[PDB]
């Protein structure tokens, strides 16, 4: 949307990743699989939850109509009472509806931001030890097993440790196969 990630350069989401909003799909000799990023997902949940509570809470005091009665020669104050009470219902209705619309945009753009930032956490870790494919995926220039995958997902990926193996592969690729 605004950040171009959700339904942008990553086109469509993963029906098969159920334990979070954002995460990883990895693929190597030992198989494949989905895995949620717990920390981003929790921050998102924390974020949206506080937001909804903040919306509920700010709308806590708000105009409350009261019935007042008037006789046949108090038509002017009866009208002023009506229009006044209606006047506030309209303001608050505007306030509620517009708040929902503006925050829905913020929420949807929030998620888009979270996915971009997660992708970029991986991107700036791997650098030229992996190849950016343009669709949300990285293809490694070196073998990365199940243990190595976990290190990437949690911030622990050691670049110097594989950097040697990567440069060797790029040389073969340059020869053309």
Partner 1 sequence: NGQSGRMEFFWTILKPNDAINFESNGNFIAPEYAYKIVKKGDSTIMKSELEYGNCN
Ligand X SMILES: *[C@@H]1O[C@H](CO)[C@@H](O[C@@H]2O[C@H](CO)[C@@H](O[C@H]3O[C@H](CO)[C@@H](O)[C@H](O)[C@@H]3O)[C@H](O)[C@H]2NC(C)=O)[C@H](O)[C@H]1NC(C)=O
Cβ proximity to ligand X, 34 vs 88, nearer residue = 34
Name the minimum Å distance from CB 31 to ligand X.
Answer: 16
Q: Which of ligand X, partner 1, none interacts with 148 (beta carbon under 5 to 8 A by kind)?
A: ligand X
156 binds ligand X (CB under 6 A): yes
Contacts of 143 (CB under 8 A, 6+ apart): 28, 29, 165
DSSP reduced 3-state for 48: helix
Tokens 């243990």 belong to 147
Segment interacting with ligand X, rule: CB under 6 A, options 28-36, 96-104, 125-133, 148-156: 148-156
Q: Which of partner 1, ligand X, none interacts with 67 (beta carbon under 5 to 8 A by kind)?
A: partner 1
CA distance 157 to 172: 24
CB 165 within 8 A of CB 142: yes
CA distance 22 to 44: 9
126 binds ligand X (CB under 6 A): no
Q: Which of partner 1, ligand X, none interacts with 151 (beta carbon under 5 to 8 A by kind)?
A: ligand X
CA distance 126 to 170: 14
CA distance 68 to 73: 15
151 binds ligand X (CB under 6 A): yes
Q: Which of partner 1, ligand X, none interacts with 150 (beta carbon under 5 to 8 A by kind)?
A: ligand X
| List of residues contacting ligand X (CB under 6 A) | 147-148, 150-151, 154, 156
């Amino acid at each position: 949307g605004l950040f171009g990630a959700i339904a942008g350069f990553i086109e469509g989401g993963w029906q098969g990743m159920v334990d979070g909003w954002y995460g990883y799909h990895h693929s190597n000799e030992q198989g494949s699989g989905y895995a949620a990023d717990k920390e981003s997902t929790q921050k998102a949940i924390d974020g949206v939850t506080n937001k909804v509570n903040s919306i509920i809470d700010k709308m806590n005091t708000q105009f409350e109509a009261v019935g007042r009665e008037f006789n046949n020669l108090e038509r002017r104050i009866e009208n002023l009472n009506k229009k006044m009470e209606d006047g506030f219902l309209d303001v608050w209705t505007y306030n509620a509806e517009l708040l929902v619309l503006m925050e829905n945009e913020r929420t949807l753009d929030f998620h888009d931001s979270n996915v971009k930032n997660l992708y970029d956490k991986v991107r700036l870790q791997l650098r030229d030890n992996a190849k950016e494919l343009g669709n949300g995926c990285f293809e490694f220039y070196h073998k990365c097993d199940n243990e190595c995958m976990e290190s990437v997902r949690n911030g622990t990926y050691d670049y110097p440790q594989y950097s040697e193996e990567a440069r060797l592969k790029r040389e073969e690729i340059s020869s053309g196969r």
